Design a protein around this motif. Sequence first.
Motif, PDB file in Angstrom:
ATOM      1  N   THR B  85       0.850  -1.197   0.082  1.00 19.21           N
ATOM      2  CA  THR B  85       0.114  -0.124  -0.007  1.00 19.21           C
ATOM      3  C   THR B  85       0.897   1.181  -0.016  1.00 19.21           C
ATOM      4  N   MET B  86       1.752   1.311   0.749  1.00 19.33           N
ATOM      5  CA  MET B  86       2.907   2.579   0.943  1.00 19.33           C
ATOM      6  C   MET B  86       3.511   2.435  -0.079  1.00 19.33           C
ATOM      7  N   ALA B  87       4.044   1.606  -0.837  1.00 20.72           N
ATOM      8  CA  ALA B  87       4.820   1.732  -2.102  1.00 20.72           C
ATOM      9  C   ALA B  87       3.798   2.453  -3.144  1.00 20.72           C
ATOM     10  N   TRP B  88       2.564   1.753  -3.422  1.00 14.76           N
ATOM     11  CA  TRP B  88       1.699   2.161  -4.488  1.00 14.76           C
ATOM     12  C   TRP B  88       1.336   3.781  -4.258  1.00 14.76           C
ATOM     13  N   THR B  89       1.502   4.211  -2.966  1.00 18.73           N
ATOM     14  CA  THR B  89       0.911   5.559  -2.480  1.00 18.73           C
ATOM     15  C   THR B  89       2.095   6.504  -2.727  1.00 18.73           C
ATOM     16  N   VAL B  90       3.173   6.177  -2.558  1.00 19.27           N
ATOM     17  CA  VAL B  90       4.201   6.767  -3.008  1.00 19.27           C
ATOM     18  C   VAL B  90       4.365   6.936  -4.409  1.00 19.27           C
ATOM     19  N   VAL B  91       4.307   5.902  -5.164  1.00 16.61           N
ATOM     20  CA  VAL B  91       4.279   5.978  -6.675  1.00 16.61           C
ATOM     21  C   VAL B  91       3.225   6.860  -7.356  1.00 16.61           C
ATOM     22  N   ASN B  92       1.959   6.914  -6.895  1.00 15.19           N
ATOM     23  CA  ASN B  92       0.891   7.538  -7.214  1.00 15.19           C
ATOM     24  C   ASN B  92       1.244   9.008  -6.696  1.00 15.19           C
ATOM     25  N   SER B  93       1.355   9.326  -5.652  1.00 14.08           N
ATOM     26  CA  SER B  93       1.828  10.676  -5.360  1.00 14.08           C
ATOM     27  C   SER B  93       2.768  11.340  -6.238  1.00 14.08           C
ATOM     28  N   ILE B  94       3.863  10.519  -6.573  1.00 16.00           N
ATOM     29  CA  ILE B  94       4.931  11.126  -7.430  1.00 16.00           C
ATOM     30  C   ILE B  94       4.356  11.274  -8.977  1.00 16.00           C
ATOM     31  N   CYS B  95       3.789  10.431  -9.411  1.00 20.82           N
ATOM     32  CA  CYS B  95       2.912  10.587 -10.559  1.00 20.82           C
ATOM     33  C   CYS B  95       2.036  11.632 -10.833  1.00 20.82           C
ATOM     34  N   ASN B  96       1.374  11.866  -9.663  1.00 24.34           N
ATOM     35  CA  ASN B  96       0.319  13.055  -9.662  1.00 24.34           C
ATOM     36  C   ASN B  96       0.976  14.409  -9.564  1.00 24.34           C
ATOM     37  N   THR B  97       2.377  14.202  -9.082  1.00 25.76           N
ATOM     38  CA  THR B  97       3.154  15.580  -8.802  1.00 25.76           C
ATOM     39  C   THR B  97       3.483  15.970  -9.974  1.00 25.76           C
ATOM     40  N   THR B  98       4.705  15.278 -10.586  1.00 25.42           N
ATOM     41  CA  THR B  98       5.575  15.501 -11.689  1.00 25.42           C
ATOM     42  C   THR B  98       4.614  15.369 -13.032  1.00 25.42           C
ATOM     43  N   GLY B  99       3.546  14.821 -13.108  1.00 23.26           N
ATOM     44  CA  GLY B  99       2.918  14.536 -14.041  1.00 23.26           C
ATOM     45  C   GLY B  99       3.609  13.173 -14.955  1.00 23.26           C
ATOM     46  N   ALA B 100       4.322  12.555 -14.321  1.00 22.31           N
ATOM     47  CA  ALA B 100       5.081  11.266 -14.813  1.00 22.31           C
ATOM     48  C   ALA B 100       4.075  10.291 -15.207  1.00 22.31           C
ATOM     49  N   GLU B 101       4.592   9.077 -15.928  1.00 22.69           N
ATOM     50  CA  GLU B 101       3.869   8.045 -16.281  1.00 22.69           C
ATOM     51  C   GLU B 101       3.441   7.160 -15.234  1.00 22.69           C
ATOM     52  N   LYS B 102       2.550   6.391 -15.049  1.00 25.44           N
ATOM     53  CA  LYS B 102       2.151   5.393 -13.921  1.00 25.44           C
ATOM     54  C   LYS B 102       2.781   4.131 -14.451  1.00 25.44           C
ATOM     55  N   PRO B 103       3.695   3.311 -14.026  1.00 23.53           N
ATOM     56  CA  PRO B 103       4.217   1.928 -14.024  1.00 23.53           C
ATOM     57  C   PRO B 103       2.944   1.242 -13.753  1.00 23.53           C
ATOM     58  N   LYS B 104       3.088  -0.270 -14.354  1.00 27.62           N
ATOM     59  CA  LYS B 104       2.151  -1.235 -14.201  1.00 27.62           C
ATOM     60  C   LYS B 104       2.735  -2.463 -12.846  1.00 27.62           C
ATOM     61  N   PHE B 105       4.107  -2.140 -12.776  1.00 28.45           N
ATOM     62  CA  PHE B 105       4.487  -2.849 -11.613  1.00 28.45           C
ATOM     63  C   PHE B 105       5.445  -2.021 -10.839  1.00 28.45           C
ATOM     64  N   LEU B 106       5.691  -2.501  -9.429  1.00 27.65           N
ATOM     65  CA  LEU B 106       6.530  -1.712  -8.858  1.00 27.65           C
ATOM     66  C   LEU B 106       7.939  -1.669  -9.119  1.00 27.65           C
ATOM     67  N   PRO B 107       8.342  -0.395  -9.487  1.00 24.86           N
ATOM     68  CA  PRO B 107       9.838  -0.162  -9.549  1.00 24.86           C
ATOM     69  C   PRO B 107      10.547  -0.436  -8.136  1.00 24.86           C
ATOM     70  N   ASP B 108      11.683  -0.003  -7.978  1.00 32.20           N
ATOM     71  CA  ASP B 108      12.650  -0.081  -6.841  1.00 32.20           C
ATOM     72  C   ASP B 108      12.890   1.247  -6.195  1.00 32.20           C
ATOM     73  N   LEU B 109      13.027   2.348  -7.058  1.00 34.65           N
ATOM     74  CA  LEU B 109      13.561   3.400  -6.546  1.00 34.65           C
ATOM     75  C   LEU B 109      13.266   4.631  -7.458  1.00 34.65           C
ATOM     76  N   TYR B 110      13.250   5.873  -6.889  1.00 35.83           N
ATOM     77  CA  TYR B 110      12.986   6.992  -7.799  1.00 35.83           C
ATOM     78  C   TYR B 110      14.085   7.833  -7.601  1.00 35.83           C
ATOM     79  N   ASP B 111      14.463   8.635  -8.735  1.00 36.54           N
ATOM     80  CA  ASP B 111      15.435   9.642  -8.947  1.00 36.54           C
ATOM     81  C   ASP B 111      15.065  10.848  -9.255  1.00 36.54           C
ATOM     82  N   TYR B 112      15.493  11.742  -8.555  1.00 40.36           N
ATOM     83  CA  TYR B 112      14.915  13.327  -8.660  1.00 40.36           C
ATOM     84  C   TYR B 112      15.483  14.049  -9.720  1.00 40.36           C
ATOM     85  N   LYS B 113      16.984  13.781  -9.949  1.00 37.39           N
ATOM     86  CA  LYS B 113      17.520  14.636 -10.968  1.00 37.39           C
ATOM     87  C   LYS B 113      17.204  14.307 -12.178  1.00 37.39           C
TER      88      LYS B 113
END
Lengths: 127, 205, 49, 51
Positions: B85-113
């Motif tokens: 739950t917390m992992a998908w929550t991080v993912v969706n928060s990021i995707c909704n902030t930066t307008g990025a694309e939503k993956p179908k499976f959980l990645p392992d990290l997110y890089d800001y640069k």
Amino acid sequence: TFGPVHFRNQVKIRRRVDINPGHADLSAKEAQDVIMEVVFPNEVGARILTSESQLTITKEKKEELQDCKISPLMVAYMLERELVRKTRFLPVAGGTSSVYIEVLHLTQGTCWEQMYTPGGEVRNDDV
Amino acid sequence: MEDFVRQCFNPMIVELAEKAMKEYGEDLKIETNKFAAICTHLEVCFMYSDFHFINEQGESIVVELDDPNALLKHRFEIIEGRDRTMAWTVVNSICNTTGAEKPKFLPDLYDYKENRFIEIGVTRREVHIYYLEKANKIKSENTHIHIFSFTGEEMATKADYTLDEESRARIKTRLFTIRQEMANRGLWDSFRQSERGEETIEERF
Amino acid sequence: PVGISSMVEAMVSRARIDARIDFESGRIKKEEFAEIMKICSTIEELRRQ
Amino acid sequence: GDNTKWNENQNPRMFLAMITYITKNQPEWFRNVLSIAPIMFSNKMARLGKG
RNA sequence: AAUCU
């Protein structure tokens, strides 16, 4: 637009009829995820949206309800009343559509019909 | 084999690995080497994330240990060392902030640069087929891929490498240490592993 | 909800995540970030011991 | 028609018979998780009340 | 011309 009243012998038959006809595209399982993405966009999880009608409804309701502060719970309850379908058994004479069932206490009686025609636009399936 | 992975790794890794294995619905005893692979994935992700902090720009400035100040910002955000739950929550928060694309499976990290996800993988077999397996699983992708091998050679997309080469060398030293300390025990043979066993377990009342 | 963690764990985790994402591009400045991360740290020192 | 003393005549043991006939040729866990209610209502008790 | 609790 009201019309005259006609007194006559009326027979009502009991039937399942729609209170809310719902959105014809969403199937009542997609609608809940639509409600989730509109109101709670970060707590939805893995579910992506696939159909085009989902995206249309989502962007419409998302730009409408942008920075409201009514309550998420009430917004969700009302979106459910908008989108999902709901039925009931009742005794019916005349019309069976939903626009004609909200006024069945006024159009139909035990001895009298009241001519009436609601004001909005009508779906062509009914016609 | 379970004894070894309990000995080598510090207890945080094995704790979170047993948590994740329980969440998977598996049995630790019927499936063991998956546990060790999960521990290795956890450790290399932690090392890939640790020893990295951010400047006013991106492109991580590295430290021995973080300095005490307002500059707490890590360049990397960790996703896999978490509940579902917390992992998908991080993912969706990021995707909704930066307008990025939503993956179908959980990645392992997110890089800001470079502003995108990362999906590290570790494999016994060498890279260039596991790479395309990872790729045709991660379809329509922007998430960078950075897969390692126990031998000492790595790979990536666009020949892009998201950090220093010294941290890569550290990962490789730990990985080679793991492999040829495994060879001392003689359990390296059992790493050709796949999900098996009938999990359609009988109901018993 | 669904989960196995204690409530405080999920709570402090989401606090950290929302802090980061809202500082990166949005409203939260550095002082708030440091202060609430300090409070999260003390919550951890209270739960784990 | 109405039935007299309907809830006093009806016995749980007949319900257990019915259950074991309706679960005929089913898995035993199902047969054994549906057989417990009529058992526990055949060995039941009753609090008398306030006094 | 209907089959959704």
